[PDB]
Amino acid sequence: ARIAGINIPDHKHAVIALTSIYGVGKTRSKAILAAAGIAEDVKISELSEGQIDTLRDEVAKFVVEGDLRREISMSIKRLMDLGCYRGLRHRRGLPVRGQRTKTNARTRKGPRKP
Amino acid sequence: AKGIREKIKLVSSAGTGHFYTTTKNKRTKPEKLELKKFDPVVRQHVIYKEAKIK
Amino acid sequence: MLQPKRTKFRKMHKGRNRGLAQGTDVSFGSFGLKAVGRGRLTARQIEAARRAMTRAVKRQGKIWIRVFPDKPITEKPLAVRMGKGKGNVEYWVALIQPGKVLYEMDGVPEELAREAFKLAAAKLPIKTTFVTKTVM
Amino acid sequence: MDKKSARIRRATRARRKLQELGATRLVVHRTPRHIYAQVIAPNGSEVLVAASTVEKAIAEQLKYTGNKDAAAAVGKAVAERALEKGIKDVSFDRSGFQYHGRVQALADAAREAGLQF
Amino acid sequence: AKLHDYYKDEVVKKLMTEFNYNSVMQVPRVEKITLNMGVGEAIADKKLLDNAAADLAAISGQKPLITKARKSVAGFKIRQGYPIGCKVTLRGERMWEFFERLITIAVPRIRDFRGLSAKSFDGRGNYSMGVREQIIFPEIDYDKVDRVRGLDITITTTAKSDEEGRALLAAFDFPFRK
RNA sequence: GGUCUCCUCCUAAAGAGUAACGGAGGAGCACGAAGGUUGGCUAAUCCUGGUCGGACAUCAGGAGGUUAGUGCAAUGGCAUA
RNA sequence: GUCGUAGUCCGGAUUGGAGUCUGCAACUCGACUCCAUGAAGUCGGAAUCGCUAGUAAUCGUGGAUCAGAAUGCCACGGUG
RNA sequence: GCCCGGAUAGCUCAGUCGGUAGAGCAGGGGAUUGAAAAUCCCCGUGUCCUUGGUUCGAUUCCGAGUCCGGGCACCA
Numbered sequence: 001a002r003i004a005g006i007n008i009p010d011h012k013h014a015v016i017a018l019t020s021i022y023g024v025g026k027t028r029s030k031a032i033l034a035a036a037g038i039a040e041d042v043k044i045s046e047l048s049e050g051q052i053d054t055l056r057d058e059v060a061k062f063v064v065e066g067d068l069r070r071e072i073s074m075s076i077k078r079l080m081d082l083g084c085y086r087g088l089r090h091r092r093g094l095p096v097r098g099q100r101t102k103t104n105a106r107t108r109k110g111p112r113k114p
Numbered sequence: 115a116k117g118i119r120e121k122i123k124l125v126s127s128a129g130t131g132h133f134y135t136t137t138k139n140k141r142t143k144p145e146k147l148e149l150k151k152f153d154p155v156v157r158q159h160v161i162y163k164e165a166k167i168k
Numbered sequence: 169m170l171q172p173k174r175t176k177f178r179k180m181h182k183g184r185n186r187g188l189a190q191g192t193d194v195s196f197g198s199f200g201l202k203a204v205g206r207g208r209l210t211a212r213q214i215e216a217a218r219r220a221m222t223r224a225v226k227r228q229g230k231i232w233i234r235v236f237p238d239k240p241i242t243e244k245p246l247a248v249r250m251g252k253g254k255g256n257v258e259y260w261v262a263l264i265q266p267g268k269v270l271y272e273m274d275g276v277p278e279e280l281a282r283e284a285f286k287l288a289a290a291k292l293p294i295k296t297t298f299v300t301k302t303v304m
Numbered sequence: 305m306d307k308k309s310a311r312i313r314r315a316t317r318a319r320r321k322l323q324e325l326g327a328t329r330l331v332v333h334r335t336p337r338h339i340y341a342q343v344i345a346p347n348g349s350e351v352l353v354a355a356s357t358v359e360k361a362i363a364e365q366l367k368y369t370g371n372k373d374a375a376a377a378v379g380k381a382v383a384e385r386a387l388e389k390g391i392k393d394v395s396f397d398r399s400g401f402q403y404h405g406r407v408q409a410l411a412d413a414a415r416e417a418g419l420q421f
Numbered sequence: 422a423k424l425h426d427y428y429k430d431e432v433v434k435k436l437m438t439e440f441n442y443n444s445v446m447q448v449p450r451v452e453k454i455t456l457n458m459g460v461g462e463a464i465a466d467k468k469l470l471d472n473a474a475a476d477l478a479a480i481s482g483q484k485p486l487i488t489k490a491r492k493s494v495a496g497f498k499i500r501q502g503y504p505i506g507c508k509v510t511l512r513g514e515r516m517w518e519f520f521e522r523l524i525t526i527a528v529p530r531i532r533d534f535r536g537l538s539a540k541s542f543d544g545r546g547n548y549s550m551g552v553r554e555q556i557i558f559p560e561i562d563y564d565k566v567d568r569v570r571g572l573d574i575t576i577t578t579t580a581k582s583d584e585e586g587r588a589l590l591a592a593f594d595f596p597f598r599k
Numbered sequence: 600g601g602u603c604u605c606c607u608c609c610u611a612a613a614g615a616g617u618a619a620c621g622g623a624g625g626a627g628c629a630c631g632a633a634g635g636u637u638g639g640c641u642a643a644u645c646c647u648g649g650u651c652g653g654a655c656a657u658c659a660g661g662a663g664g665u666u667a668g669u670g671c672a673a674u675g676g677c678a679u680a
Numbered sequence: 681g682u683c684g685u686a687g688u689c690c691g692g693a694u695u696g697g698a699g700u701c702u703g704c705a706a707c708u709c710g711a712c713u714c715c716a717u718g719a720a721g722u723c724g725g726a727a728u729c730g731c732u733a734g735u736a737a738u739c740g741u742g743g744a745u746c747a748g749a750a751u752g753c754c755a756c757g758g759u760g
Numbered sequence: 761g762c763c764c765g766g767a768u769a770g771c772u773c774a775g776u777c778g779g780u781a782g783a784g785c786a787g788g789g790g791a792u793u794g795a796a797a798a799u800c801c802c803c804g805u806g807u808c809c810u811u812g813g814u815u816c817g818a819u820u821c822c823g824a825g826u827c828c829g830g831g832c833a834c835c836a
Contacts (some may be wrong), residue, residue, distance in 0.1 A: 001688085001689090001690030001691055001692090002688075002689065002690040002691060002692080002718095003690075003691045003692030003718075004691090004692065004717095004718065005689070005694090005739080006683095006688070006690075006737070007687075007688055007689080007690070007691085007692090007718070008686090008687055008688045008689085008690020008691055008692095008695095008721095009687055009688090009690075009692075009718070009719060009720070009721065010687045010688085010689060010690070010691070010721050010722040010723085011719090011720085011721055011722040011745085012687080012719065012720040012721050013719065013720025013721070013722055014691095014692080014693045014694090014719060014720035014721065015693045015694050015719045016692080016693085016694090016720040016721090016754090017687080017691080017692085017718085017719035017720035017721055018691085018694055018717095018718060018719035018720060018721090018747090018750090019582060019693080019694060019695080019717065019718055019719035020687080020691085020692085020693095020717090020718040020719055020720085021691090021692070021693085021694090021716095021717060021718010021719085022716070022717055022718055023694095023695085023696085023715080023716040023717030024692090024693070024694045024695055024696085024716085024717040024718045024719075025693050025694060025695035025696065025717050025718085025745070026694060026695065026717095027596040027695035027696080028693080028694035028695020028696065028717060028718085028719095029521075029692085029693040029694020029695065029717075029718065029719050029720085030693050030694035030695070030719085031693080031695065032692080032693045032694055032695085033693040033694070033720090034457035034693090034694090034745075035714065036692090036693065036747095036751085038692085038693060038750075039720090040693075040718095040719080040720060041720080041734030042693095042720070042721070042723085042724095043721030043722080043723090044687090044692075044693090044719085044720060044721025044725080045691090045720095045721045045722060045723050045724070046575070046720090046721060047691075047692090047720095047721065047723095049738090050453045050694050050751060051691095051692095051751090052690090052691050052692060052693095052721080053691080053692075054692085054706090054743095054751060055691070055692030055693055055700080056691075056692050057692090057724085058692090058693085058712095058753085059535055059692060059693080059694095059718085060712090060713075060714085060755055061712070061714080062694095062696080062697085062714085062715070062716070062717070062718095063697080063698090063714060063715020063716045063717085064715070064716055064717060064718065065715095065716080065717090065718080066715095066716095067714095068714085068715045068716030068717075069715090069716070070715090071475060071693060071715045071716075072697090072715070072716065074452070075697095075711080077719090078726055084708035084756055088510055092529075093529075093530075094529045094534055095529065095531055095532050095533045095534030095535055096531065097532060097533055097535070098535045098595070099531055099532070099535040099536075100528075100534055100535050100536040100537045100597075100598050101528060101529025101530075101531075101534030101535055101536055101596050101598075102529065102534075102536040102537035102594060102596025102597040102598055102749045103523065103537045103538075103550050103596060103745095104528075104530070104531065104534075104550060104551055104552020104553070104557075104572075104650075105527060105528065105529045105530030105531035105533070105534035105552065105557065106527060106530040106531060106552060106554055106555025106556055106557030106558075107530060107531050107532070107551075107555035107683070108530040108531025108532045108533060108534045108555075109432030109526075109527035109528075109529045109530025109531065109534070109555060109557060109747090110431060110527065110555070110557070110558045110559065110562070111555070111556045111557065111558065111559020111560075111563060112480060112522075112526065112527060112557045112558010112559045112560060113522065113525075113526030113558060113559055113566075114480070114482075114519065114520070114522035114526065114558045114560060115627075115628085119627085120628095120629095121629080138630095139631085140630095143630095143631090144631085145631095147631085148631075149631095150631080177814090178812075179824095181609095181622070181623070182622080183609090183610095183621080183622045183623090184610095184622085194620095245761080249620095250601095250620050251619065251620065251621060252620075253621090253622090269632080297836090307677095309641090311641080311678050311679085312638090312639085312640080312641090312678085312679085313638080313639070313680095314676095314679090315679055316679040316680095317679085318679085319679065334613070402638090403638095419643085435654075436613080437675085445810070451659095453659095454659095455658060457649095457651090457658040457659090458650085458651090458655060458658090459649085459652085459656070459657050459658070460651055460652085460656065461656070461657070462768065468642080486657095487657090488655085488657050488658085490657070491657090492655075492656065492657095492816070493656075493815090493817050494635095494816015494817055495629075495655075495815085495816040495817065496654090496817065497655075497656065497814070497817085498816075498817070499656075499816070500816055500817095501637080501816080503657095503677075504657085505657055506656090506657035506658080507657075507658090508657075508658065510658090540648095541648065541649080542647090542648075543647060543648045543649095543659065543660055543661085544646080544647045544648065544660080544661075545647085545660065545661070546660085547648080547659060547660060548648080548649095549647095549648050549649040549658080549659060549660095550650095550657095551649050551650050551651095552649095552650060553650035553651060554650070554651080558606065563618075567655070568651090569676095570648045570650085570651060571651055572647085572650070573647065573649050573657085573659085574658080574659090575648080575658060575659040575660080576659085577659060577660065581606050583647095583794045595680070
């Protein structure tokens, strides 16, 4: 019913509603249906046990939901615990990719502190 | 011109004195209300609510 | 330069009668074709003047003739005269006696341009001030 | 001010010279430090005048401290009393820019015993 | 107050030596800023986005202007009359405020932060900031954002020229990249 | 067939005015304000910058000079607007 | 024991990150694992198929082919 | 030559106080048929005839043009 557990994407196209899972995307949720036969134009309901559940099979290949995030939060810390610039910036909510933290970075830093 | 929709004539009038004073107005544009001053037979101005009073 | 009696782009009026006076020019290139003798080019002439200014030798040399029309005419078919005047379709440039043709290229041009003069509307000498101290 | 422009209503009345003609003005000035004034015939006789702060008057530098309705007023007083002649002749004081506070204290400072309007 | 003092006290004299003039007046001053959001709803500017100024208001602490429009008929379905703006400028003491509340608080708000755009000087001195969204300047319950059409802001200064500038801003600005 | 009133410009010979079934257009209104006055303010357009732009949207400075705007034709006029 | 009718604790398509095992070799074009992503779909018009008892219904188990690509095919039993 | 009208989907046509336009047919994809039709389901890629103007913006409003259509060209 939830495939990868929790969240029941119902009354929407397959792939489109498949991405609902906190791990797949427009492409991934798509690449799976191919080797699953299940089309996109079919609403999860329209499916059957040998249709909706089958999806839950080739999904255990990728990582998703809770632990996926945790495994990342930790992995991040792995390189972040190190006194590297990235971490030093990651533990301050500052852009670690390459933006101008000097200004314009709301969504980055956070709310305004006038 | 004399379309019952656009500009019409405003007979206008004063408060006690039996004056006249005329002008033009409309219909669709906010109406059913009017009053200025204007000078009567003699003396002061005041009133002249004309037709269509507030 | 060209004529195609290219219309002055489009309309903006189309009337006025006529009236000529005196010429107003010198030179720009090298060889010239002075006007002299008042008249008016049929415009269609300038096309004939140019179409003939290159037969033997290639389009080589910079031919620049410099006179610009602007002068609707109009005529009437086989009708009375409601004094309106139908379309123009003629275009007769006003030419008093200026003089304009340029053959940027060293050569004999005289016998070359005169080859096209007969196409013109009237007589017109040549004269060519290769240069300039005539006028500051 | 005048820097950015002159093409402003500030000149509209200054052209009181026409019609009013004889109508004389006061001008009056701002300049943070002083105020000035002076009164001349319209334009037909700039060969007339009054007085600004005129340092010498009671002491040497016109011993006065302030600029509010206090100093501003006297700023006019001199032109006023000194030009006793012109009063009934109906002058005018020309705002120049704005008619408030400083110039007000200057203008009204005259309205008292002077410039009959 | 906050920062305006860093100026005379530890900012003027750097410029008085570097570039090197002689008047503490010719010392590059900071005129104002002026924020203003932009894109308005051609048709929908009404209830939608009137709360758009509600933000820029308190974000600065003044009264927005909301501005109007100077564009006629051609392709954009608006006829030179709608609000569709905000503006809001600060030159007063409250100008240094929003400054001591930029460099310090959230110049670095996005994950894509790295500093300030080097090459964005107006050609004679001032600099036009931009950035796209979020609040960056919290002072809201924050459970109501409607991605209120960003922020522009353009600090105006008496900077003589392009490069004459930079060194000015480059003197408190703890955020500007490298 | 078209036109028969009125308004603008050219013809209309630098005071008026003057014709043609001469060359171009407008009116048969609008406006408790689009009037009065007082106080105040000045275009269009482009250049460089600016998130939501990729021609033009509000912002910043600069070049910013009837090339704007005049309730509706054209002429004349308009910054003291 | 829980979660309490929401697109969810449903359903899993997709995609990204990185990995295993077969086999010279798996870009093209493989099976699987982990992490993250988590769509359509809230039972499906017109019309249409199978099924009369251990049947239909559903739940698993094995095998042929085969180095390694099964929701297909063949086959077994549980509940009914 | 003159006046009046038309020009919109492949055909024949309907339509708009000025902002994103349709019908019958043909066309196309499903269906049902042994197969065609007939029938059932789902489908418009229109620079709204051209060229100037008004306008922020024109298929629409203004002028002109081509083309078609109706009428007319008479006494002599």
